[PDB]
Amino acid sequence: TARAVTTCRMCGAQDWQEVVDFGPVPLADSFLEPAASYDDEPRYPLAVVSCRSCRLMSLTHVVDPEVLYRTYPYTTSDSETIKKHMGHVVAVCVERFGIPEGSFVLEIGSNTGSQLKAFQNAGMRTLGIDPARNIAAVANERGIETLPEFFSVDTAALVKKTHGTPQLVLGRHVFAHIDDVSAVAEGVRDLLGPDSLFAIEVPYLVDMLERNEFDTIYHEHLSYIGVGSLVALFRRHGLRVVDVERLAVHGGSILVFVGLDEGTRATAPVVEELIALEKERGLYEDATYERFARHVAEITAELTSMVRSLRAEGKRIAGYGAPAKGNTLLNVCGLTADDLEFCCDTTEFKQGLVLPGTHIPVRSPEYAKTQAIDYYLLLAWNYGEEILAKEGPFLADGGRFILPNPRPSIVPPGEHHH
Ligand SMILES: Cc1cn([C@H]2C[C@H](O)[C@@H](COP(=O)(O)OP(=O)(O)O)O2)c(=O)[nH]c1=O
Ligand SMILES: [Zn+2]
């Protein structure tokens, strides 16, 4: 079972507004083998609360990290989207702060090591940290040195002793996936030199709220982060937020840069601008999160209505992709195998399995091309541009997509958008 949240991860306060509660829900990355019975399927409470002090949005509970990340499965290769995105992260980091060739770059949650490989091609020394022993060994086999550890003050000391001081410490997602964020911040304080940088990429709370991206809520994502809440945290551990760039990836993200409070790196104007923006858009006002909760109910309702309306007309519907967020969407909407006859997915592990809760079967794309599907529910909507670029034939035949946000809509639209 999962441990309930008491004090706030970032600022330490305990003043929680209730925003939305989806009740007990199965884990989004727990894909099941097909069976007659699913009675013993575990379910955990999924609900979010907003810290009135610093306005971090957090899940009400925390599912054991030994269950989640110690045996993660993860695709070798990746989207052309990701490959280019990884190369952009390198460019931003290296060029914006003039990191010389031969510099040392440490990555937390380094995974198979594709991101580190990009830094090596840019002429850098690297080292990975990832507690998934199965995946750490893969990266290690490929020639990308990776310590099978959790990041902490202790691991930071080990890195410094064996590999020296890093110019750049990188953490993607790992930041919104870790509960003890103080421990990470503390380990970073010890490890950074006077001019070193800590960079983290997470989904941006502003983007989430304005686009009603409620499906991005699942148990792996403990935190939903704005800049204000990070400043609040890093204040308490002798660190200063120095720069931020907004990114389109993952439905709207921010790449945040952090240095030592008394270090070389000057704070850019963008940091305070994004804090001024967060105030202006109502992140510190209860109304905004009641409005968000209302939008969820409206979208949930009309999206189920839309699906069942089409199925009543005899139109066949399926899912495109089987990402974690799809499993939130489908469970919250209460859709079954009677509603979506399958979900196509490129990941080989997932093919032949069944979705958590809904128990909708996952199939390969080559099977999907045999079927005469009328509508595809675009569960992997954050990869919309890549997917629509290659699905010309489907579109030409009269096929359509159902996009779930910012409001439910049908692609293609009835008229050309100028
Ligand atoms: C881009 C793309 C993704 N997918 C699927 C494969 C993965 O299971 C899933 C990717 O989502 P996932 O890796 O779960 O999270 P994120 O959306 O943050 O990457 O989408 C396809 O099936 N076809 C595609 O063309
Ligand atoms: Zn807080």
Cα dihedral 252, 131, 186, 45 sign:
positive
Q: Where does a domain end: 221, 241, 260?
A: 260
8 Å CB contact between 62 and 3: yes
Angle between helices 181-191 and 227-235 (to 10 degrees): 60
The protein residues having their C-beta less than 5 angstroms from ligand 2 (an ion) are 8, 10-11, 13, 51, 53-54, 56
Residue 152 shares a structural domain with residue 18: no
Return the exposure string of 173-201: e unless at least 16 CB atoms fall within 10 Å of the residue's CB, then b.
bbbbbbbebebbbbbbbebbbeebbbbbb
164 lies in which domain range?
A: 60-260
Tokens of residue 394, six digits = 């489907």
Residue 34 shares a structural domain with residue 148: no
- Residues 389, 256: Cα–Cα separation, whole Å: 30
8 Å CB contact between 326 and 343: yes
Q: Would you say 84 is a known binding-site residue?
A: no
Q: Where does a domain end: 221, 244, 260?
A: 260
The two beta strands, 44-51 and 197-203, are unpaired
Q: Which long-range contacts (CB under 8 A, 24 or more apart) does 12-16 make?
A: 12/236, 13/51, 13/52, 13/53, 13/54, 15/51, 15/52, 15/53, 16/49, 16/50, 16/51, 16/52
Give the closest residue to 345 by CA, choosing from 324, 320, 325: 320
The two beta strands, 362-363 and 343-344, are parallel
Entry resolution in angstroms? 2.7
| Domain at 1, CATH number | 6.20.50.110
The two beta strands, 343-344 and 317-320, are parallel
Residue 174 shares a structural domain with residue 289: no
Domain count, the chain: 4
Residue 386 Cα: closest atom of ligand 1: 1
Residue 205 shares a structural domain with residue 118: yes
**Angular region, 198: left φ>0, alpha ψ -120 to 50, beta rest:** beta
Please report which ligand is nearest the Cα atom of 8: 2
For every residue of 149-172, DSSP letters joined together read: S--SHHHHHHHHHHH---SEEEEE
Cα dihedral 98, 103, 106, 107 sign:
positive
Among 85, 383, 387, 391, which residue has the most ligand 1 atoms within 8 Å of its CB, making it the best to mutate? Answer: 383
Of all protein residues, the one whose alpha carbon is nearest to atom 14 of ligand 1 is 323
| Domain at 112, CATH number | 3.40.50.150
Give the closest residue to 200 by CA, choosing from 92, 306, 299: 92
Residue 289 shares a structural domain with residue 187: no
8 Å CB contact between 186 and 232: no
| Domain at 334, CATH number | 3.40.50.720
Residue 86 shares a structural domain with residue 215: yes
Residue 233 shares a structural domain with residue 364: no
- Residues 411, 13: Cα–Cα separation, whole Å: 44
Give the closest residue to 386 by CA, choosing from 83, 91, 75: 83
Distance, C-alpha 222 to centroid of its chain:
10
- Residues 12, 90: Cα–Cα separation, whole Å: 33
8 Å CB contact between 137 and 118: no
8 Å CB contact between 54 and 10: yes
| Residue ranges with strand state E in 110-260 | 125-129, 146-147, 168-172, 197-203, 223-224, 239-247, 253-260
Q: Which experimental approach was used here?
A: X-ray
Among 75, 253, 345, which residue has the most ligand 1 atoms within 8 Å of its CB, making it the best to mutate? Answer: 345
Residue 183 shares a structural domain with residue 277: no
Residue 318 shares a structural domain with residue 304: no
Residues with CB under 6 A from ligand 1: 79, 250, 321-324, 345-347, 350, 380, 382-383, 386-387
Q: Would you say 383 is a known binding-site residue?
A: yes
